[PDB]
Structures are given as C-alpha cells and as structure tokens.
Design a protein around this ligand. Structure first.
Ligand SMILES: Cn1ncc(-c2nc(N[C@H]3CC[C@H]([NH3+])CC3)ncc2F)c1CC1CC1
Length: 297
C-alpha cells in the first residue's frame, strides 16, 4: 500500500498530534496487530525523535510505559512505532461532560503518582504533566493508565552520584501554562517537585471542572503567562480546594513545600488518597465514570 515503515507497518488514518510530530494508526501486515506510529519530518532544524525513542527504551519495564516496536527512517521522515493506546484523560473528561466523581479522581490519582514516580526513579522529569498526556490502555490494559510524550523530558540528576542539575533561573516555561508549577512560571529550573505540583493542578482541574486562572487574556504570550502566574500565586490553596476533602489541599501544600533536591514521598501521597478513598467506602474495581456510561449505552 501507499505508506509502509520498517518493511511491515501500513499507516492508516491520522489519530492526532504530539509534542514534536504527528501520530497515525497502523497495522502490522505480517500478524494483523494494530499499532501507533509517530512521524517526525527529517527536515527539522532540531530533530528529537531519536531522543524520545532513547527515553522510551530507558523506561521499558515500567507499568504503563508503552513498548517500542521500531525506530528508523522512511522516505523523508524519522519514524517511531509503539503500542496503540486508548483515549486520553481529557477525551474521557469530555465524554463524561467535564465532570468526574470523587471515586474516579482518587482511582486515577493512585496510578498518576506511580507513573510519575517511575520516570523519576530513572532520573528523568517529564515537564509536561497534563490530562492529554495520560492515556488509558486497550484490551486487557483498558484500566491501566499510561504516561506518554517524553519530548520535553529532561535528566534531573547523575546516575552515580545523584547530584542534581544546577539550581538556576531564567528558564523558559517549556510545558503547558495551565498546569505549570509556580516556580516554573518564575523561570526556576524544574525538578521532581514540579511534576508533582502539576499533577495537583490536574487533580483540582478534574474536581472543580476548571481552574481560576483559565479564560485569561493579554497582549502577548509572555503577558498571558505572567497573568496565569500571578493568579496562581494570589490564590491560596485552601481557596482553590474549598469544598473538597482536606487531602487535596494537603497534597498541594506538601508539593510546594518540597525543596529543589528533595525526593517526594510517593508512598505517603498515595496513602493520603487511599485512606480517603476507603473512608468513602470505595473499592478499586476500575468502575470509572466512563465505565458507567459505556455499559448503560
Ligand atoms: C501525543 N501522543 N503521543 C503518543 C500518543 C499515542 N496515542 C495513542 N492512541 C491515541 C488514540 C487517539 C486518542 N485521542 C489519544 C490516544 N497510542 C499510542 C501513542 F503513543 C499520543 C496521543 C495522540 C493524540 C496524539
């Protein structure tokens, strides 16, 4: 057919766009398995796909890390082939009319903290934690959450010594402004704490349906980012999390309190949400809000 990569993956329709390229559905012509294919044009001032493919290789063996099938060059493109995955948390949020129950938020939180933790144990930070980068799997993996898109990810410490990258300022906000940590807005070098703060804004985005720094306008990119920053800094966490269980405010205070080099206590943060979950008499049965709507049909 018209477009086949690595001698066997026939590219079908476009399924979306990522950080540095476009994503297609494909089929392995030798066994019939459906996969996802990421194409980056080889004519790029600064090509990164080789870099992202190296990160995925480093991360193999993690729960909710997609397996890589092939990396290479085809026609005028760099090509990466991987597991096909299901919808993002943003897709599912819209499917549920931009409302999630507490049970769903807490079940997701347990997996999200763990996905981020794994990336950190391999000495990387993600730097673009948002609903669009968390995907549910498919088939028997449909209740497994995957964290993807390592285009903006960065080594935060040395493997041998565990010395961090240098503490410094005057960094561009590289990720998404809505979920960015306060220190990232100020141009401070991101570390593990910033991924965790970002997850806190995602959880509160799901709980509230919106964040108070949404809908802001300004003359420039930089001034919109500066308005978002100022709103984040002038909104107390108790106000942001008013009318929700105290655990969400505790999460956010804990993450802001972390020092640049300090290891988040992931076990404690998972425990914080799990004790709440079980106090509300919920069980981890993977009956999410979208599961309810599908089986009713
Ligand atoms: C950004 N990025 N990078 C890798 C992948 C990515 N996406 C999928 N499936 C998508 C189907 C359409 C859904 N709306 C989203 C999930 N499977 C594997 C992937 F690596 C994606 C998600 C595709 C929307 C870009």
């Amino acid at each position: 057919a018209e477009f086949i990569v690595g001698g066997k993956y026939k590219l079908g329709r476009k399924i979306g766009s990522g950080s540095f390229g476009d994503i297609y559905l494909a089929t392995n012509i030798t066994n019939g398995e459906e996969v996802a294919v990421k194409l980056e044009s080889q004519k790029a001032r600064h090509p990164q796909l080789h870099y992202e493919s190296k990160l995925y290789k480093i991360l193999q063996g993690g729960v909710g890390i997609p397996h890589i099938r092939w990396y290479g060059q085809e026609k005028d493109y760099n090509v990466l082939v991987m597991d096909l995955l299901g919808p993002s948390l943003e897709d599912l949020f819209n499917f549920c009319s931009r409302r999630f129950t507490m049970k769903t938020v807490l079940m997701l939180a347990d997996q999200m903290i763990s996905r981020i933790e794994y990336v950190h144990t391999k000495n990387f930070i993600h730097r673009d934690i948002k609903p669009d980068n968390f995907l549910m799997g498919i088939g028997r993996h449909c209740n497994k959450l995957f964290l993807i898109d390592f285009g903006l990810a960065k080594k935060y410490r040395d493997n041998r010594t565990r010395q961090h990258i240098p503490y410094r300022e005057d960094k561009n906000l590289t990720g998404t402004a809505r979920y960015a940590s306060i220190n990232a807005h100020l141009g401070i070098e991101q570390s593990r704490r910033d991924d965790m703060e970002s997850l806190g804004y995602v959880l509160m985005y799901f709980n509230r349906t919106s964040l108070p720094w949404q809908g802001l306008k300004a003359a420039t990119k930089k001034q919109k980012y500066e308005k978002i920053s100022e709103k984040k800094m002038s909104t107390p966490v108790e106000v942001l999390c008013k009318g929700f269980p105290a655990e969400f405010a505790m999460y956010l205070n804990y993450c802001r309190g972390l020092r640049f080099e300090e290891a988040p206590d992931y076990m404690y943060l998972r425990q914080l949400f799990r004790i709440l979950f079980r106090t509300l008499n919920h069980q981890y049965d993977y009956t999410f809000d979208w599961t309810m709507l599908k089986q009713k049909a």
